[PDB]
Amino acid sequence: ATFEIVNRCSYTVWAAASKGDAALDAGGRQLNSGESWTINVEPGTNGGKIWARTDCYFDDSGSGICKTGDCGGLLRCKRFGRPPTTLAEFSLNQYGKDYIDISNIKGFNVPMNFSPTTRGCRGVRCAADIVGQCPAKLKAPGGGCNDACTVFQTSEYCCTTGKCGPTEYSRFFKRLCPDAFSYVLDKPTTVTCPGSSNYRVTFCPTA
Numbered sequence: 001a002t003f004e005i006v007n008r009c010s011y012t013v014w015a016a017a018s019k020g021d022a023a024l025d026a027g028g029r030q031l032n033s034g035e036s037w038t039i040n041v042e043p044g045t046n047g048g049k050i051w052a053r054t055d056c057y058f059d060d061s062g063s064g065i066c067k068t069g070d071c072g073g074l075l076r077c078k079r080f081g082r083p084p085t086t087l088a089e090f091s092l093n094q095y096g097k098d099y100i101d102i103s104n105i106k107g108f109n110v111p112m113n114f115s116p117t118t119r120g121c122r123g124v125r126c127a128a129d130i131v132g133q134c135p136a137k138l139k140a141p142g143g144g145c146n147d148a149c150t151v152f153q154t155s156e157y158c159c160t161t162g163k164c165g166p167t168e169y170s171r172f173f174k175r176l177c178p179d180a181f182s183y184v185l186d187k188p189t190t191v192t193c194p195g196s197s198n199y200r201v202t203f204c205p206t207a
Contacts, residue, residue: 001092002198004038004117005050007031009204013052013110014066016077017041024048027076030056031203043093043196051085052110052203054143067142068109083107084144086126086180088114088201098193102126103181104173108134109144113205121193126177127206135172147173159184 025039056066062075071077084107115123134145148169
């Protein structure tokens with residue numbers, strides 16, 4: 001499946017694409033404002049994610065650091081990134097269907113639209129000013145708004161017992177972005193698309 005990743009933000013982002021134990025395509029690339037990066041993702045890929053990283057410095061070997069979403073210091077990510085990261089998540093060709101969603105369970109750093117470019121399903125967006133409105137205790141110095149599991153490490157925010165409810169913190173994310181997951185047991189906002197759909201992820205869809 002092809003994903004076109006477009007940076008509509010006024011600032012540079014370093015896109016990342018991983019399935020947690022391997023890079024997807026090249027794994028990451030710098031995108032200046034306006035630039036688009038087309039990747040191919042193998043059919044059947046389960047648990048893929050795409051995210052943006054902000055304020056990164058990389059050396060000639062592709063080693064360095066980013067203030068949000070850093071994936072162990074690498075330009076080309078093999079592993080998932082450090083929160084806070086707005087996530088576009090997908091599992092492809094799962095019993096004839098693709099499944100996509102946007103999640104704030106690892107916090108929020110950049111607004112995003114995740115939409116098919118082929119027919120048969122709708123896209124999802126989280127474009128609110130979550131960092132501007134972020135409760136004081138979740139603000140990340142690096143930039144971004146952390147989720148409460150990352151900050152407080154409790155069984156209730158991390159849903160570690162498989163039973164947990166919404167919280168003051170998850171309801172903040174949900175109020176601003178109803179179509180994104182706000183906690184691990186949120187009512188699912190997953191969209192089902194035809195198997196082998198193609199997609200576009202756009203950072204800063206409104207700006």
